[PDB]
Amino acid sequence: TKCYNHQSTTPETTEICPDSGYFCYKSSWIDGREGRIERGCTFTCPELTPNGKYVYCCRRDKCNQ
Amino acid sequence: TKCYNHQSTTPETTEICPDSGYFCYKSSWIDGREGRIERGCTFTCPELTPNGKYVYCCRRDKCNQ
């Protein structure tokens, strides 16, 4: 799998995941008042933290824009 | 928190979540060849299993259509 891995609204980048068990994720949260997004490869979908807005985990190449 | 809780393509239904540590999810997976969707309230974001297409966890009312 290939996934986006750029943070927030930084310029788009991709990474090729380490193995076939990986999928993509996109996680958005508020830190104090500041919205941020993390993107990348993972083999496990992250928990939605108390200040998290959403977590999206998806299997298909570049699904996590 | 009010989340959709209808399965797959059934008529929309909602539920009001029990406690404050609750958010909504939508989970899409394949059972054999058949696509299925589960929606509802949760306090933990579901794992994306090998047969899953995506998991989406979100906080806003009706965010998980």
Helix content of chain A: under 10%
Here the CATH topology of chain A equals CD59
Computed CA radius of gyration of chain A, to the nearest angstrom: 12 Å
Number of helices of chain A: 0
Compose a concise summary of this entry.
The PDB classes it as toxin. The structure is a homodimer of 65-residue chains. Chain A is mainly beta.
Please explain how this structure is put together.
2 copies of one chain form a homodimer. Chain A has 65 residues and is mainly beta. Chain A has one domain (1-65): CD59 (Ribbon), CATH 2.10.60. In chain A, 0% of the residues lie in helices and 48% in strands. The first copy, chain A, has no helices and 5 strands. Chain A has strands at 2-4, 14-16, 23-31, 34-42, 52-58. In chain A, the strands form 2 sheets. Chain A has a 3-stranded antiparallel beta sheet with strand order 4-3-5, with no helix packed on it. A two-stranded antiparallel ribbon of chain A has the order 1-2. In chain A, strand 3 and strand 4 (34-42) form a beta hairpin. Chain A is globular, with a radius of gyration of 12 Å. Strand 5 of chain A pairs antiparallel with strand 5 of chain B. Chains A, B: Homodimer; non-covalently linked.
